[PDB]
Structures are given as C-alpha cells and as structure tokens.
Amino acid sequence: SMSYTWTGALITPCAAEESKLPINALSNSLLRHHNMVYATTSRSAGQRQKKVTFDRLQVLDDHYRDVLKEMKAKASTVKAKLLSVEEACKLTPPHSAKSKYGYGAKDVRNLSSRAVNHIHSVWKDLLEDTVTPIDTTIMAKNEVFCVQRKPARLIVFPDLGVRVCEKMALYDVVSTLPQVVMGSSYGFQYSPGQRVEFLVNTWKSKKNPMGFSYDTRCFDSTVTENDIRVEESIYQCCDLAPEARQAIKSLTERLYIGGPLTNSKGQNCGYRRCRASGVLTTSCGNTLTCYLKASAACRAAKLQDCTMLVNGDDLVVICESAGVQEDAASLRVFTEAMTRYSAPPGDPPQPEYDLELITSCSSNVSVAHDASGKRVYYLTRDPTTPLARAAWETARHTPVNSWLGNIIMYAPTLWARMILMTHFFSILLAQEQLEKALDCQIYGACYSIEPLDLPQIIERLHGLSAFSLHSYSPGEINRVASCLRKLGVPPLRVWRHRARSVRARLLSQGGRAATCGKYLFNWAVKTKLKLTPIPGWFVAGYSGGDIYHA
Ligand SMILES: CNC(=O)c1c(-c2ccc(F)cc2)oc2cc(N3C(=O)OC[C@@H]3c3ccc(B(O)O)c(F)c3)c(C3CC3)cc12
C-alpha cells in the first residue's frame, strides 16, 4: 500500500512565506553569516512529497504478536475518562487554526454558543457515522535551519471542531496509557534532569553496557493501516465510557487510518494511507508503534537485557554486550526485523560503548562539574539549529519562541547560558518586556511563560547545579566554538562581557529581575554569590496535537 497518492494539485501556502533571514539592528550582534540561515516554504513541498511517498510491505511474526499481547494486558489496567466539551475547549491553543465553519480558537476557548453547538454536532456525527472519511488540510511547515537545504516538512490536520472532539475522546488516554504500557521506557514522563539520571543508572545497570540509536526513515510514512488498527485495539483495552469507545473507533476508521488531503485553497491534493502528523494521537501512536516493533526486534536479534527508551519515533536501546563482533551482528538482525516490521533505518545503527557517544533527539549526554567539584551529567546538543532560530526570532516575532523553550530545556548547557540567556534578556531589558508572557513549546505542548519565572522553572527542572556548572568537557566546548565560527557568532569571551552588563542591569531593576540576574548570570562574575533555594509539564508527548496549558 502506498503511503500517499497525489492528484498533482499543489500544496499551497495560507499566507506570505519568507525563506531568507530577516535582518534588523540587533542581528549582527548575534549572527554575521546571514546567508547560512533559511526557512522552509511550500516552494519545496514537491520535493518532500517524493520522499514521503512509498510502498509499505509488512511481515509480522510471533515476537511482534507476543509483545502486542503484553502491551494490551497492561493497557487493560488503564481507566480513562471522557473530557467534557468545556474541558476540551480550554486545552485549545489561543492561536490554533480557525474552523472552516465560521468560528476560531478564541471562540472555542470562550465557549461561544456557535463553537459549542458545532462541536456537539461533530461529536454526534462521530457516534452515528463510523465510515465516512474526515477531511484534512495539508500544509507546508515554515521552519528555520542552517545550511548543510532541507525540503519543508508536511503537516496534516483536521478541522478545529474535530480536534476538540479528539480531546474529548482521547486526551486522558494519550496522557495516561503510554506510561502504563511502556513503564520507564516512555520518555515524555521525565524532566531533562530525571532523564539524564535514568539514562546514567540504566547504563550502569549493565555488566558490559552497549547502546545504539535507531532512526527510522520517514517514520510517519512507514506507519501502515495495520499499525493504526493495532494502536486502536490497544486504546480499546482501556476501561472506557461506551460513548468514548464509539468515538475512538469512529476517529480511527475515519481519520487516523487515512483520508483525503485538501490544500489551503480548498483543492483535493490526494489521499493519505499513513500517520497524520497533525492529530492528537500522533505522539502516543508513534511511541506505541515504535516500542512494539523495537521490542519485538530485540527478541528477534537475541539482544540480552534490553532496555528501550522511546519517545515518538525516536528510539534508543541499551543492553548487555556480547562482544564487539557479536554486537555488530545482532544489530544487523535487529535492523532486518525492524525493516520487516516496515521500519527501515535512514542511517544504519552503530553500537556504542560510551553513553555520551549516543545521539538521540539531536541530544547527547555530557559532563560538567558543580560548585563542589562533583561531576554532574546533563543533556546538550549541537547548538546550530537553536542559534539559527534565535537569529530569526531576533528580527521577527514568531508564534513559537524557540529561544525560550531552548533556554528552559537546555539551561545547564554552556551555549544556552552564555549566548541565549545573555542575548534575549538584553533584548527584553531594552523593550522593558521582562514581565510579558511568551508562548513556547515543551514536548509538543504549548505553554505561556513569563521570562521572569525562568530561575524557578530551571531549579525545578534541572536543580540548583544548573546555575553553577563549570569545567565543561573539551568535546562539548569545541563543538560550540566551531559552531560559533561557522555561523559568524561572536566568541564566548564577548558573551561573557555582555553577560556582565546584562547581569548588572537586571540587579538594578530589583525584585524578580534581580533574581534572574543573580541566578542566571552567576557564571559571568569572578566572585560568585552563594546560590540558595528560591521560594503536568512532563506527563506525555503532544507534538502536532494542538494542546495548550497556562
Ligand atoms: C529516545 N531518546 C530519548 O529519550 C532522549 C535522549 C537520549 C537517549 C539515549 C541516549 F543514549 C542519548 C540521548 O536525549 C533526549 C533529550 C530530550 N530533550 C530533553 O529532555 O531536553 C531537551 C531535549 C529535547 C526536548 C524536546 C524535543 B522535541 O519535542 O523535538 C527534542 F527534540 C529534544 C528528549 C525529549 C523528550 C524529547 C528526549 C531524549
């Protein structure tokens, strides 16, 4: 079966698209090599269509079925509730795409009668009709990257009314089920701090540890009808209200399995037979399916004492080594199984005998030292993409503020502390916008966050040590420095100087601003201040699922 069929109608934009990095008075202070940064547009949609369009063959053995049975047995302990309309409505982002039927996200959020009435009619229709394919819109994503150009990713989503109904039927399910079924393997349950601790403990729990990342080529496209039905059977194991059972079944037959694709101008672009990127179940479904296939593949490959870590389509396995030669052999078998299960890798997996050499979700584990000299482990990444996006956000206001999300999730890193914190606090100070709440994304969910709350947020997510880390590793330092040269970003020494200024300016404002200066920029001073404590973020993945929290 083909992942997609196309009519030839173009994937069209819904507004003006910029590909070239916007430049303002602030731009050069962050980034000089402007031509290396770009944003994807609909212009490249055709190239992506080619990539994501292919035939899927599936061969399912006893290992696959054994694992599924186990997953279902755990799922049968889950009790999920129906969300009311009002509850579902409040989970809708303020700037979520408006309905084709004469209302928008704010109307939904305000419980306007027109909005509520349509939502009730969509719900009723889901209960009564389990066969009619539900329409979806296909769009090209506008995302920023550094050169070496990627084609635009595609997003596929149904109407607002349907999206609210998805929440009613499935929000509690996709929030609770994955942790019950996958236990400690479910990655979205951890803060970054908890994650690092889990990965370290897992690595140490093996006598002779070996690990590898496994990245499936175009995962969404590899997801077949079988997989989506199997996901449903898992959901249906839950203790559910009968109305919820019917809705979930209906949503599966009519939306999740597949459906027609309509562009922004209202033309039929073709047909989908794979995972929709823009539904509530995208994250949960991918996670379950990846876990199922991977666990089965571990058994097929005879890997000993396998621990899986799965979130969305991202996968890492840590297990007991059999030796360098046997390990390499076992991974080829693992890969053969995954491919049979329809998920071949983009890049072939490589066994690793050092935790820090494993990359997943663009991140790796690294080490610094805290105030006492004690080794602290933390999560970092290549800062190329964060810096590219920060540059864009310096000249343009965007729906999602990546810089803020990056500061939050990567607060312990040298690059986030020295560059991102310094640069953006400087900007906020000059505009006196320290107290203004900004929108950002954490594990696919949208949050409204006041920058002044950063120190408190960071202490909770990472611990007090985030504000005093030093003696970063040479490998990490060199990666950052090399990236800075590549993008024409000033060197870290300059950022130190700027941070002193920003710190002093924050302290002069007093109050919460002073606390930001004290904790966030303590690294900038020679004579450090003594840092003391300050008086459902990580439940599930929601990427593409139109979820919001205040
Ligand atoms: C299956 N892979 C893993 O669980 C992970 C390993 C890993 C595992 C084994 C190994 F050997 C080495 C690294 O590192 C991770 C880092 C993060 N992250 C985080 O917590 O802070 C920031 C970073 C992050 C956040 C969000 C997004 B986003 O929504 O696209 C992102 F792309 C990166 C995460 C987050 C849950 C996704 C997941 C893993």
Of 363, 382, 407, which residue constitutes the final position of a domain?
363
> Rounded distance, CA 546 to CA 550, Å?
14
3-state SS, one letter per residue, for 276-302: CCCCCCHHHHHHHHHHHHHHHHHHHCC
User: What tokens appear for 528 in the block?
Assistant: 């450090």
Find, among 331, 283, 348, the residue nearest to 310 by Cα. 283
Q: Integer distance in angstroms from the first to the last C-alpha of the chain? A: 42
Residues 547, 443 within the same domain: yes
For residue 363, report the distance from its CA to the centre of ligand 1, in Å. Answer: 6
Find, among 514, 528, 533, 518, the residue nearest to 456 by Cα. 533
Q: Which residues of 466-483 are buried (b: 16+ CB within 10 A; e: fewer)?
A: bbbbeebeeebeebbeeb
For residue 359, report the distance from its CA to the centre of ligand 1, in Å. Answer: 9
Residues 208, 228 within the same domain: no
> Rounded distance, CA 227 to CA 223, Å?
6
Distances (CA, A) of 47 to 10, 41, 126: 12, 11, 35
**In this structure, which residue's CA is closest to atom 8 in ligand 1?**
360
Name the percent of the chain in helix, strand, coil, to the closest 5.
50, 15, 35
For residue 457, report the distance from its CA to the centre of ligand 1, in Å. Answer: 18
Residues 144, 21 within the same domain: yes
Residues 150, 201 within the same domain: no
> Rounded distance, CA 439 to CA 446, Å?
7
User: What tokens appear for 191 in the block?
Assistant: 């803060």
**In this structure, which residue's CA is closest to atom 2 in ligand 1?**
360
Distances (CA, A) of 530 to 30, 387, 503: 30, 31, 16
Residues 9, 118 within the same domain: no
With beta carbons less than 8 A apart as the criterion, state whether 360 and 312 touch.
Answer: no
In ligand 1, the atom with minimum distance to the C-alpha of 190 is 20
With beta carbons less than 8 A apart as the criterion, state whether 418 and 499 touch.
Answer: yes
> Rounded distance, CA 464 to CA 418, Å?
17
Find, among 340, 345, 337, 336, the residue nearest to 313 by Cα. 345
> Rounded distance, CA 173 to CA 238, Å?
8
> Rounded distance, CA 318 to CA 136, Å?
39
Residues 86, 75 within the same domain: yes
Residues 343, 405 within the same domain: no
Mutate to test the pocket of ligand 1, among 145, 360, 361 (most ligand atoms within 8 A of CB): 361
Residues 152, 301 within the same domain: no
Domain holding 88, by residue range, is 56-132+159-186+224-257+274-280
In ligand 1, the atom with minimum distance to the C-alpha of 314 is 1
User: What tokens appear for 443 in the block?
Assistant: 């594990």
Q: Tell me, what CATH number does 317's domain have?
A: 3.30.70.270
For residue 197, report the distance from its CA to the centre of ligand 1, in Å. Answer: 13
**In this structure, which residue's CA is closest to atom 19 in ligand 1?**
192
For residue 400, report the distance from its CA to the centre of ligand 1, in Å. Answer: 19
> Rounded distance, CA 22 to CA 194, Å?
38
Angle at 483 between CA 482 and CA 484, to 5 degrees: 90
Q: What is the dihedral of CA 138, 140, 142, 144, to 10 degrees?
A: 130
In ligand 1, the atom with minimum distance to the C-alpha of 311 is 1
In ligand 1, the atom with minimum distance to the C-alpha of 315 is 1
Of 363, 381, 414, which residue constitutes the final position of a domain?
363
For residue 61, report the distance from its CA to the centre of ligand 1, in Å. Answer: 30
In ligand 1, the atom with minimum distance to the C-alpha of 441 is 29
User: What single string gives the DSSP state of each residue in 438-477?
Assistant: EEEEETTEEEEE-GGGHHHHHHHHH-GGGGT-B---HHHH
As for ligand 1, residues whose beta carbon falls within 6 Å of it are 187-188, 192, 195, 199, 211, 309-311, 314-316, 355, 358, 360-365, 379, 409-410, 443-444, 543
Residues 353, 431 within the same domain: no
Give the total number of structural domains in the chain: 4
In ligand 1, the atom with minimum distance to the C-alpha of 443 is 29
Bridge partner list, 175? none
Residues 97, 9 within the same domain: no
In ligand 1, the atom with minimum distance to the C-alpha of 188 is 36
Q: What is the dihedral of CA 468, 470, 473, 477, to 10 degrees?
A: 100
With beta carbons less than 8 A apart as the criterion, state whether 6 and 267 touch.
Answer: no
For residue 546, report the distance from its CA to the centre of ligand 1, in Å. Answer: 20
Residue whose tokens read 């729990």 = 205
For residue 467, report the distance from its CA to the centre of ligand 1, in Å. Answer: 21
For residue 360, report the distance from its CA to the centre of ligand 1, in Å. Answer: 6
Of 273, 305, 333, which residue constitutes the final position of a domain?
273
For residue 505, report the distance from its CA to the centre of ligand 1, in Å. Answer: 34
**In this structure, which residue's CA is closest to atom 26 in ligand 1?**
443
Residues 354, 440 within the same domain: no
**In this structure, which residue's CA is closest to atom 24 in ligand 1?**
361
User: What single string gives the DSSP state of each residue in 33-88?
Assistant: -GGGEEE--GGGHHHHHHHH--B------HHHHHHHHHHHHHHTT-B--PPPHHHH
Q: What is the resolution of this structure in A?
A: 2.3
Residue 157, classed as helix, strand or coil, is strand
Q: Which residues of 93-106 are buried (b: 16+ CB within 10 A; e: fewer)?
A: beebbebeeebbbe
Experimental technique of record: X-ray
Residues 196, 247 within the same domain: no
Mutate to test the pocket of ligand 1, among 363, 404, 410, 447 (most ligand atoms within 8 A of CB): 363
For residue 315, report the distance from its CA to the centre of ligand 1, in Å. Answer: 10
Contacts of residue 110, Cβ cutoff 8 Å, sequence gap at least 6: none
